[model samples]
Target: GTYNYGEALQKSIMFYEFQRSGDLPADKRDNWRDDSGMKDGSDVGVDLTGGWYDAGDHVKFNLPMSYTSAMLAWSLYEDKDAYDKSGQTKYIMDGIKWANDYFIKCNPTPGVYYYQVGDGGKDHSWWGPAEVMQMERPSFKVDASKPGSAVCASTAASLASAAVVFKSSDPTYAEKCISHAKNLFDMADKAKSDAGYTAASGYYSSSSFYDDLSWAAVWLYLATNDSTYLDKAESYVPNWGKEQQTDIIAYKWGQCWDDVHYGAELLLAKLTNKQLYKDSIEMNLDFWTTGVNGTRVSYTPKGLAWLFQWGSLRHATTQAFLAGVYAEWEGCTPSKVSVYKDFLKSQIDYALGSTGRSFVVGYGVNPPQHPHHRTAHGSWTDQMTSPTYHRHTIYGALVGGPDNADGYTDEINNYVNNEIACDYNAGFTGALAKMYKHSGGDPIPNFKAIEKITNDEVIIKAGLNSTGPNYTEIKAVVYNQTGWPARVTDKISFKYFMDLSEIVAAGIDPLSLVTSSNYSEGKNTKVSGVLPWDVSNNVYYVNVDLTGENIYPGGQSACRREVQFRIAAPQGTTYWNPKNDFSYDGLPTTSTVNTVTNIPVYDNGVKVFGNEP
Candidate 1:
């Protein structure tokens, strides 16, 4: 749940100032963290993701930017471990240690704790030595004891803190971090009531409360050995995973975070030896993975499988590790989901290779796995879950453009101008920032303008980056687009990426479409009894349209748009994005399509959404 642009950059600036100026303030300035950024000057990164801080009459600062910058640096330094890790990896273990030793230092103020920062926001509590640390002094404190406040907003900090404590090589600092994280975790837990977790202090009964609380408890349990945390966590699983428990019309919650929350809880429960959590975990899995039987949507009755954005890959990554740890459920683990997310990769490839956003439906080539099936084709909204697709849509955009594989999109322009409240989007955005860096794209243009300015994350890259525990530790492969690190500049308008690794893996030729080129001028009319030579396909009319339903219901598509897909994977599916598209220095290959065929994939029809953060 953690590891976002805010935390990623916040921690970076802290480390940078510490190294450059030998300063680490105890009290944090700015409402979020570095309110003084973009003015008082330490914002050294100057890339797309940096320079997002918004403080009054402020100074300016930016961080060095690149999706694979750090990894590239490590590679240059011959640090195989760090270089080969991931473009999206964060130092959680390091964050908690810093918070404990540097951030936990006492402050003159009563309730707040302070951290060092480089910017010059007047309210900055401490200065000198290190510029940025998650310090909290009385004058610059947030809702110290609540989940709603920005203090608890950067879930990345919390997770990094817990990760530090969870695997502390140093006993002393580890204990200290564990101590404080427990406090935040406890505060979040306290927010929960019979109704679920509170939305915030004022919104006592907001459903978001349940959402944050569910996610927070996992971190709480990790931070502290409190078994009770797991018990409390389970109470809200039903409500928090509203997507799995409720319907699209009911809660609009997506399967990504819900799956992440439940998976983490169950995995941790199993790891921590809380046997009681087994059934709940399994049920939660079954809810999404095991396609729902009666609903037109597809989910196995006992298997947990969900379809969302590129973030879905992270969701799958979590299961891979969980599968390794929990043996009984391990049977449900597909060797492919971990070693390779071939299924979705294939689907994505298919979407990219299609005629614009619309794939040519058929048998064999566009076989039964095709979208023409009654349930699969109707609208992007029919099947794509909101909480999930919203983030995915952004990720797809971050990758840049269309692929020649199979499925879909041409930037339908759905931006509700609203920010995603769930912490789940945090890391995904981090990935997007990095990908943008690699592909010469922009990270959520005006991302800071759209949302309330906070002293949290920063963005520099984009695409399939990893963030932690299971989601991390998978694999990292920077695209073949080679250029020494390219700094973010206005000159480049990143072309979109089309990930087409899976279709080829499914043994489906890019030419599988029922076009005259592949048919030897035979003028084949129907996909029926004709040569079943090279295709295995089915055609149904199930409604799995996403654009139609989500836009109609969300009324918030101006800022977000997504394409969702559902595919049936054999128990052991494994795939990766071979045609992984990222920014290029203007080059074309066999897979590269300058075809430029626009057929108007989606209708411009999304309005704004709701009354919650």
Candidate 2:
């Protein structure tokens, strides 16, 4: 399959837009996403409403989130021309700013930083859209008394990198970012420990913080041109992870959210022209590209440098970016330059469909259809399997790659092979830009993620609860199965129409029919009295107004409200023939509910679904 690097690059940058949480901007491109996590920090008295949701779930783990932003800023900083040529400079900048803005809010004070938001257990207990989440989202913070060096340093790196990128465009914001970056770096350096970062214990626990400290210092040095930071960045090299039984830097793994010495050394080599940093980065890049002393990262049958099973593509492509960046440097060994460059291209191409399929969610030949994402699935049934397929195409998202044997599946439940995350695309995005600059391809024009609604947004299901000669009982359920950006609807109502010609002809006033509910799901449900619909035609209806009931696309029970009501005629009256009713044409005989279009549904007086007589 021929891959379009330009389109892939464009979409890669656009992927961050879909991961945005909190109040969305007016110019948001897609219609399938809305403001979510609006009260993220309400529990902590500070506004922590915006940031990218880490991976497919709703938790905002700051480690990966900040790592994601820094990598993106590094990409933009390295390949602004590629983004400019692809007409995606504005998008990438906006994405970086969005995360950085949230980082600023995270540092509410000089020494305190909210490292994470939303409880992982409570957040993962349900499967639904973010807009309708009803769980308690508690915010977690770290201060001097409880230091979180990893997250603090990672966020500092993100801000510093952002400051470097935004210097020319928005100097004031750049200064603001530098201020926060400096403060965060100071806190992390002073603490020099991650013992306080226990909130994200199981999910994103920091294994080491020295690499983060170095990574943050390097970015700060780049942003502020401070020699002290450069020295500090180099000082942490001795404390970095080392190979077993040796003092040499670990070359087995690639740059990731947890370890960033690969990136710090690459920048240090460029900045200081020292042989140590140069040898360090070259050794790591060489390990990924060729072999260093008979050792190399495992490679699949295809060409993926299969790292850990967690995020193989993430590790490889990030190294590819590092390789591409280093290969362009004049200090790179002339003989290994093409090797590094080829490694960069090969890794990115493997992800873009050199293997006959794309690992990205919505691009290239035979692209992944089911990415493990909560918002993209948008299930109203509170079950991952209920929808059976993704409701929205999370375009540009790079999913977890194939295993060592190149084994893969597009199943939504196979999160290991199909999960999409902010970090997954971070390096892949930058690599795509480099690929685009090297090999040009046309990006899709007017590319947007706005999806056409596949299912009815709002609908009503009905069945006959019970019926007698004198009365007609109805079991109606109004469901808020909205998927075009699933939302909560507070004002909902449905009407049941009837042909009153029998009563009219029998010399009985149609309006005299009594309306009452035997059972209603919520307290706000009300059954309106028989009302005139068309007096001349002797047609009337009863309004089932659920105006005060909060109906949302959260789960089966939460998404729908059931009401069993009866429109009774006079006592002992035989003229109440429901067979002639407009809404009862195809109604189910039993209590089992089935969707019925005859019963019209309205949202705040606007007819959103069904028909009228």
Candidate 3:
């Protein structure tokens, strides 16, 4: 299916609710998705529903949660046209209300806000869905005594931002968010130093609360047009601006858990009529969008703005989301708007598999099968049960994406390549909404020419696409290609046509596989077994029929992908093949199988295309 931005956005919100802690309302929960942790509480009896799990794992990390919530709300604020026009207002409203409801539950009493619901250490040890949370996940809090300004402030910003989204549709709920936001800001404002912040266990740790304070203040100002909040927002600008100016890679981090500089920038760019705050916002935006820094911002030839090996899509999508917001700003000219919009759409499409494959799980063509998620990974492993090949597809979840070199694998254990998180998709969903609204409901692109990544396609590699005669066993890699831009809901396989006795004079068929592998797009499965014990060295003929319906929409009944390789005994290797002709379309045709010398030696029986340019 083509990138269903509306459906995907809706499903992403479902993912959060699936991670919901505490009791579920009988009427509220659509009942299709079951609830869990109904009785989540501390020894002191505090409720912990409404907040989402941090990532594939179960811990409810408040910092990212608040940031995720705020960004989702901000998306609704800026891209309201898209949500409303696309008839996705209910979904976006549902999305913000879920998180906003939790933030309210978190800030139950005055200045104290329960920032976290699950222990980092406990959650990581378990390997199951939130529905079956057996461990005693303790909650953590921030207040006058505890002093977690950053988390509190982010939650405040999240609540206040959502208030703006709910103002007209649900005035009563909007007032609740505003009321909580004010109390939270006061608590956060009281503690500004690093010492005032609670220690986040190995996740979302902050070096300083400077950016968080600025982020919170701006949102509060926007909610009420309060000069007090506005003045506090500008107070941190000089310090943040000077630091970002001196440090080159500062803006590269974008709007994330550790950094809210972009959030402040976007807000101040709109609100701060002052020259100082306005110029700083433009300067930081220029640093990220323009080539002011090194060539770090350029896309991989695949058009993926892959910044790092871990959570690459998160960074790219976040930047894209900010770009969309900036493009929609009052000052952006039509041309500037066009440029930024194009950049945003291109990045989102790339993630949706405009390049070679889609990064999101279970929606786009040949979506990810094994997103390193616990709930999706049912316990079992012989044929299924390995979290690597999860039982349930984490639909609408965006994975921690490709490395800098554009290399990616669908292996579930490769968390760097497969894990899905709340923060990663927050901005991505928002950006999709923006694109949908901007293009007058044409959220995703329609391409005439088929596009895909070369490496992501079906690759045949067996010790450099060959098996030595002396080797007892050979390992073959069948890099399975998935459908482009949508799920290919058809049975697919690779059937090898090889007469082993014809080539090497072996009595039995040495084609290897007992059964042909069922192919899934973007998946890399191993087709390995023992080679014949006494096999002669010779060039072999193998025809592969990659058969599947609706794979390409319109084409031959089945496409032909050939793998021709020479096998020879080492040292006394004589690569000779008397027959040079082959059959093509039932006609005898001559083909070129050139012999080469000084071939670049492969490392570890695998060849890697060098670092991404």
Indicate the worst ten consecutive residues by lDDT in candidate 1: 477-486
Q: What tens digits encode model 2's per-residue C-alpha lDDT throughout 395-484?
A: 999889888999998898998998889999998888898989998898888788788889999998999998988898999988888987
- The TM-score of candidate 2 is 0.99
- Arrange candidates by TM-score, descending: 2, 3, 1
Return the lDDT, model 2, position 589: 84
Off by over 4 Å in 1: 1-167, 170-173, 193-206, 226-260, 272-290, 295-613
Question: How would the candidate models be sorted by lDDT, starting from the highest?
Answer: 2, 3, 1
Better of 1 and 3 by lDDT: 3
Pairs in clash, predicted candidate 3: 1-486, 21-49, 147-196, 356-453, 365-485, 365-486, 380-385, 482-521
lDDT of 3 by residue, 216-326 (tens): 888888787678988898787655634534643245557777788777877777775555545554554455455443634656767777566768889888888888887
The lDDT leader among the candidates is 2
lDDT of 1 by residue, 1-613 (tens): 1112232222222222211211223442212122212222123221111221211111111111111111122111222122123232233233223323333331123333222233243322321111122222111222345223222312322432334434535566556554554554444455443222122123112334454454545555555667676566567655544344544212222323222344445545555555545544444433333323333223222222223433332333233223323333443344323322332222222222322231211111221122111111111122222222121011111121122121233222211111111122223232322322222221122122122322111111222222221111111111111001101111111112223335445774433322111111112111111122123332111111122221111112211222211122222434433223222112233222232111011122221111100
Tell me the spans in candidate 3 whose CA falls farther than 4 Å from its real position.
1-4, 25-32, 194-199, 241-250, 274-278, 293-298, 333-335, 380-388, 440-613
* TM-score of every candidate: 0.35, 0.99, 0.68
Per-model C-alpha lDDT, please?
Answer: 0.27, 0.91, 0.61
In terms of TM-score, the best-performing candidate is 2
